[model samples]
Target: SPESPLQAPRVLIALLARNAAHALPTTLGALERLRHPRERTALWVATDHNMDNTSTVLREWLVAVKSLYHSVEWRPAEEPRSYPDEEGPKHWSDSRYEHVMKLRQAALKSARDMWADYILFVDADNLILNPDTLSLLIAENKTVVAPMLDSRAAYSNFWCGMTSQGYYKRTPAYIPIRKRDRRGCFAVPMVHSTFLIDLRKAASRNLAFYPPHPDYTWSFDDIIVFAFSCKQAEVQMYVCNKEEYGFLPVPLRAHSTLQDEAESFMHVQLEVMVKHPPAEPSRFISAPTKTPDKMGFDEVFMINLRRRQDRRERMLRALQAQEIECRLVEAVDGKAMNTSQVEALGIQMLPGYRDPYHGRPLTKGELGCFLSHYNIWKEVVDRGLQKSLVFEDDLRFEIFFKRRLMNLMRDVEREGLDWDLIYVGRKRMQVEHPEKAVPRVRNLVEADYSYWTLAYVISLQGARKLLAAEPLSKMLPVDEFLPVMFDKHPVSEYKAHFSLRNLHAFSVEPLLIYPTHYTGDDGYVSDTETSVVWNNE
Candidate 1:
């Protein structure tokens, strides 16, 4: 059964975007890498609206690669913007839904008008990691189908059920299908974000992404509205979880600007590369770094537990690989210390000091943590070091770290900016109160009530300021005190908790360091989470 060259089916690939110029490189890069014949595919792209120069980038990209595909066209350069009807722009609002619904319907119509056999509607955020996805979908001959996609969370590309009131409902059957407990194209109530549609089927003729059923009897959304249309037309939608096809990241952070979204891409790219590495190095991933040894700082201090040589050696090797130098500062292992030894610090929990997120008290480990940083700050004052970098034993540096560090440091100096503390790694308490990016400051944001002392750079002034606060009087974790010093903590009474208010704290954008392992990752361990109190176990 040799299929002749001219007999190959035509496919129209469509993508609708809004403020997603940064993602286009990855998504469009995926388009070029697809195993399917480019000559047989038509790219019909239209941007709904944008917050950036999305149209310019798209047009520029097409200029470079226009000849490869059968067709490339996306109009509407100057589109409008949307404000959040909900808590923020991270969640969908009604106007956003209507705009998307119309564009999606237009895409479907474009494919039908062009006499193409199939059209693949892929959301701009959906990354096609698998090159064979197009061929695989077309081979299955499903009238409507989607290759399964997953993000870090239990998020996926399909829904297993819908309510009678025409809304999303996850049935007990959903998880298995998502997990591919039985691998095949299993019928699902709806599939979205990325999917294939066939013009060959009678039901395909009825599939519409907009203007819900006359008896829709429910809310109108691009996804659910189509699902309603899909159901009313009696078309069986399926998700082929036969393979790991691609990735769809979790929604954009609510407080994120265009730059923030772009900065977040590095982490997403890393996750994708871990699963499917390029044959050669990815230029997108690998950039240049500066001389790590010459990043002028009085000291690069690494905090490590004296008893835990395992973490110490592990971190040392990582630094060695990166060709960076640092002096390992012995950590105060709360577990190894006698109760009286920890009690000697006179650490006292403030009354009404319950953490807003956790109604809790400090662990014994936290008491030890204070002494560790307090010792460093004491050294900065005693030795008069101008500025020093501090790193916890458990951390992974971002790619091209030294280069970014150099630029960030130079920017701080060039602008004659005064800063006492700058975080290299931080857990932004976004849900409670997000970190605010400093206007006109490149790659710098004001610290929020954040957690994690994974990595930071502190000036001599900062050290003296922290030590002067007498944080030991009010015992909280070093991470907590760090923010409190900057006057960012949610607990307002903390003003009296410490004698300090402002420490001139700022944070580096696209944090340069992260914990080496997360909860589900292999060899994941947390000294803090091992036990609520350091019982020496």
Candidate 2:
């Protein structure tokens, strides 16, 4: 039974330890804690040009555990260091990538000669928090497998996807691992630092760390080198965060000056950027800097109260760019409403009216929407304006939205279409035979039900209709209330307005504008839905 070769597979832990004296002690301690059978596991360490008493510390540790492992192999190279400029104190040269790989090959060759079942290339700085980590990687039976490694602030050593130009790109697969429930391993394109390789499996294809490709002359880190070789050899790579054994690099912190700290941080950034330059420029969505001189509207009003200065500024800038004569309408602050305004508006208190979707009582946000739209409507009637464009702060538009809007307005006037209100942007619902509509203009569509008041054009006739239909006995979401005028349901409270079906509305298809909140690509937070934490009601 003792002589049986099938009892336990032999594993070789290979490492390239340079000047890692600071982190080496914890790593070595973790290695000693591994539960793998000592007789079937060997430690192979190769150090290159380590000057900081690393040799003494490593030799002492090896002496202490000399009899605990099957065999201990050490290959120390104390060659004269090159690239002092690139590899100075707290600095790393691109040339060191090649040096590290060369040291790694020595360990791999030694493992190959011993015919080890598996070789785990653990970095000198990695602190394996779990004793069963090595055994777990062995049990996976994968050609290459790694545990998810992370440190403070969600820094990770794994990348889910690679861009066409070989830069790291975050995928949906890359989310907060701590937030997820434990699960099995998922395949990834690349992993770094601590990973296990099936030496026998990889050796069959003569796999080894590769040199930089002729086409890519910038630089190649050792992880990229190994990953690229595996990719070429058709070796699948996997990472398991569910194992719960992995932890990220523990940051080394000490008090230092601002300039010194900044310089240290910049080096790390330079290493990654110089190694993998982006193929294209970074795409950032920013508002237009300058407003256009030509005007699109006779009057444009943006409702913004409780003054979210950033939101107001962004809306004003966007409108100014189109040369639209826009003015800020002080919104009715429902949150700050007095008893008089609340009673006059017939504000339905909690337990009285709730949103059907959320099943929650109406918030001041909803009431604010009602008062804002009502005031805009009242202003339109008082000014006797034939038409005006209304906007909410959170709105984004396509480049051609202004031209298309102007053309649609002209077409409405030319054809004398009975367009009481036109929604430039809204959340649309499909109606019976949506495609059956004959467009009054080329791009306009008649809607069955659409919600959202972000962008819409209202006429004097349309404004009066809304004011007359209000003085609410029951409060409802403004968007929901607006669409109820079209409902044919007999049980609807809006049935009274069905007789006054004079409010004709149309929408632009291939919508030229969108709400920043609903459009996932906009990268914005909703002011309405977001509540103040201190003033929880």
Candidate 3:
């Protein structure tokens, strides 16, 4: 039914230009030197308006293409917008920032429309580069986007028009955006520029088309684009070097104060290459894959009130009837509670976790006291399954809970969606708006789905990933953590291989199951606070 997944190409190149006839020769020439063209690659030119000498620039551009030994094609921006009553600068007018934005959108549209595998964006001013750049890009397909920036001449002199001063210097005005910033590069959706995309992965994330707007403006286009790529399309972007992709040309005045030939811009090798052999690139290891495996659960996962324990008992009984496995577990401190009261309900309560076959660890922690009893759970998880689900004493069930669960499992088995974490509770406990009444439907349902801890299963890999991460140190409420993880590491990363379901036929109760916990009773405090538990009716 779905088009088979496309294999990632080695690299894709994009160049944005306008009336830069003076620059075309150098830029196109540099591209010719890139190492391998046999690998799938395409070059796109985003022209706002190739005004006076436009044809000349186009002709020179073609000449440069002809000179290249590799196979490369060209693209031009074609999106149209109706003119408003009054005329303003066409969105792709003069500013370099705006020009790059339009260029990126155009280039991305071309690749997506054509079903291209990889795309790389380059400036039209590059003139000097090594032969192996493209090959290096292809070789490092795991995660890479652009090449490093370099000056043409060692030290060239050009007019400082703004200051109107004769200056001799060699330095670029901009470099790659830092990791801490919201964005990464000048190209929106950085991965499309000189990087590969697992189209299938993107589609599963509900990203049918790459969003051109990664940020509010174009100043940090690539950075924002890369962040979006990290969020929507990929895990990391790499910057190529001079030996591989070549360099940009910088013209120098021969008659400068330092007239020595060696010092002249022309004599200086402005050309650089970025193709590295056995290229070293970083990938998103934390990214969840489309598999049954998931790391353990963290303290910040969402927790649902299970005071309605009958529902859980009913579901367990049904599982037994269907010849499915069933077991009753107690938390570390819960053994006392189990022995004193709950054990009589026919739910099994062993001293330590059951781990009958020693296959995996169990997930049980004192319900209301989980937050304070973090140590107990940590010890249980240390045996390997770092993630464990802490259940509340109250777990209720809908009449159709078992049927719905069986149906979900069957669908999962049939359709084969790549999912990691699967939440069984409806009306997840952590989302901003957890309880809005509405009919359920498939496809994009946007009621702020959230992290849920009650009756949830996490993967071993996810647990390991979280444990290794340092920032999420303190145990925040699981619901609070759900929003963060959902934004950062969501179902999309798992490629539909994992997911959460409210069991279709039933729904988890509203977030305010007990009414006073999460939705606090504002201003309802007492002066003689011996302990709120004693005072609350």
Candidate 4:
């Protein structure tokens, strides 16, 4: 290493924050770890358009690091805005862009007013992973420069080419540049979100984020306007890929929510610094899977028809192979009984109900399937079991079901998520549909319209809620009934009766359970499609 430093120049790190609470910690921590002396660097931040706790975290950080830095300044929003944490598409709003541009304009002036040597504009979402990043960028000997930020997907801090109208255009060398298949600090049309401005350079000082430098002809985007400003004086910008820098959140490439954005930051920070990525949670305490009885639940239940010993034997063998102990809940065979017995059990279809999907009345076997799951719900309530894992006989397990499910259970416990129902297996009707992660809770999502009550985890409260609905008197098929409970049923008519449709339902992503056989599988069987009661010649 070279001697400490030839000179300690003032570097002001500036940020324009919005809905970025989840990122401030890592970004600020990176600042703390900048390897630059705190006496020479100041921190400046301005935030107004945050729906998350961006403001509070910034203040807290400033307070915590009070005496460490030379100067710390904050610009808080004028008034509080809250709507269960809501925000529209962030990049396109005119007023949002206006506020951002103003912040940019303010940050530049602030850097000038403070008489700092170099002002580094860093997005709150950008993680400065290296300690020498500041010195490294300054050493690049460019008026404006940024270290190349990596991403899991095709995203980075720089764009190589621009169209005649001044927007991103694919370049032949883009892949090579992004992959660092060719390594060096390459001059580019734009370097945004994170870049260093050598305030001493007169040409670079002319850059602006708004009011479009008079000759601007691009769209009203903050980045676009800023890029156009750079074009005014041929302000050359370079991105260094000689070493590993930080990364951008991968979720930014597509439509996602605020939480999804947060998840991206959280995971990417881990990936870069920790050299790890989040997986099916395995950190929490749990018993060994071979123990066969302690999978982190009160009981594991497999609902099966009493008459189907053939199917039951196959299921039992598989369970033994997987070392899972299950309580066999006998299915209610409504078809084998007289109408009087069925009515006595309070099993009756809703007066005008029809199968919305199949365009037919619920089959007798479907009715029986409904009664089977309902009985388990009742038993769960009666026994006061805290939670139970329930599966139909047709379901199959993933190879590592025990470890993964136990890990999921521990995750749910550690987070203390108030979940009523979490599906372990089901038909995801919305194919290729990505869902927002359920708040900070890992391994689950606010489930969408799904099919088949094939497998799920239900709490005592969930059982009580299902039984409290008294669904037996206004029945639908069990497959349809589960969705109605979760308020994700496709038919609006079904939702009419399920008032207060807030069951706190969730589903495991990358589902752990599926039908052991499909329609064309060599040994497939469908109890609901062709009722066993009718096939009993």
Winning candidate number (TM-score): 1
Q: Write the per-residue lDDT of candidate 1 for residues 405-496, one digit (tens) a residue.
A: 87898788778777899999988876565567776668998877778899999998899898888776676777877778888777777666
Lowest lDDT sum, 10 consecutive residues, model 3, at: 279-288
**Which runs in model 4 stand beyond 4 Å of their true positions?**
1-5, 78-91, 251-255, 273-537
When summed lDDT is taken over every stretch of 10 residues in candidate 2, the lowest stretch is: 278-287
The collision pairs in model 1 are none
* Clashes (N, CA, C under 3 Å) per candidate: 0, 3, 73, 0
Per-residue C-alpha lDDT of model 3 across residues 378-430, encoded as one tens digit per residue = 43457564334333323333323333444554454356443334455434433
Q: Over 4 Å off in model 2, which ranges?
A: 1-5, 79-82, 85-87, 176-182, 202-204, 212-218, 250-537
Model 2 per-residue lDDT tens digits across residues 345-424: 66653223444556566566667777788888888999997888888877765544566788878877877877667778
Q: Which candidate do you rate higher for TM-score, 1 or 4?
A: 1
Give the per-residue lDDT digits (tens) of candidate 4, residues 1-537.
677746677899998777877667667767777877888899888877567677877777777776888898888893554323334444345666777788888888888898898899888888777778888888887888988888756788888998888779888877898898999999898888889988888886778876777977777788878877877878877888888777777535324567557645644643442232211111211212343564768988998988888667766656654567899988876567666677677676766677665666667787778878888888888889998999788666653566678888888888889989998998777668686687666778878888878889999988888887888777887777778877878788877776656677788987888776788877677777663332122
Off by over 4 Å in 1: 1-7, 79-91, 176-182, 252-260, 275-537
- Per-residue error at 114 for model 2, in Å? 0.7
- Per-model C-alpha lDDT, please? 0.76, 0.65, 0.37, 0.75
Report per-prediction Cα RMSD to one decimal.
10.9, 16.7, 26.3, 16.1
Q: After TM-score superposition, what is the CA distance of residue 532 in candidate 4 from its true location, in Å?
A: 52
**What TM-score fits each model?**
0.58, 0.46, 0.32, 0.53
